[PDB]
Amino acid sequence: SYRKLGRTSAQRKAMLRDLTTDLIINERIETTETRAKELRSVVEKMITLGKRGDLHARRQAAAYIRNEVANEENNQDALQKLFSDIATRYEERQGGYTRIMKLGPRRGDGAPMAIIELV
């Protein structure tokens, strides 16, 4: 199955889209353990969608990724950064683009923190 993360379907789609585009931006992300575990599969789907490079995959990735600015003074969006730099880094691999590293639990929640990194 897939985890529901205690929120409705539209909230889950919006939160996963914001998280996958912020991972494309920042190249490392601190989230809770299960947000990390559900983010891993979707970010790898986006990366293998961008590795094809054709315009149909471009329009699918533009349907999924938020329109957030990815670099200063270059006008590079998250979609263009994903396609160009991520595919350019990642022709050689196949599968397994993400790392999950556990951290100590949250002070106010006791929620187990986690780090998503992209190698």
Partner: protein, 54 residues
């Protein structure tokens, strides 16, 4: 829905006998000096299976 009689201190302590919390599963860090949970990044060292995490 109402307690008929008060629970005595003996029954109170016998119910509370399972209310402990266990020690966290802990491991000495390979980068040494501090003590860590298993499968977690050490907070002082910032290391996990060798090397830095920055």
């Amino acid at each position: 829905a109402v307690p008929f009689r008060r629970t005595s201190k003996m029954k109170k302590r016998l119910r509370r006998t399972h209310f402990k919390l266990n020690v966290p599963g802990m491991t000495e860090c390979p980068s040494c000096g501090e003590m860590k949970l298993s499968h977690r990044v050490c907070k002082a060292c910032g290391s996990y299976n060798g090397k830095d995490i920055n």
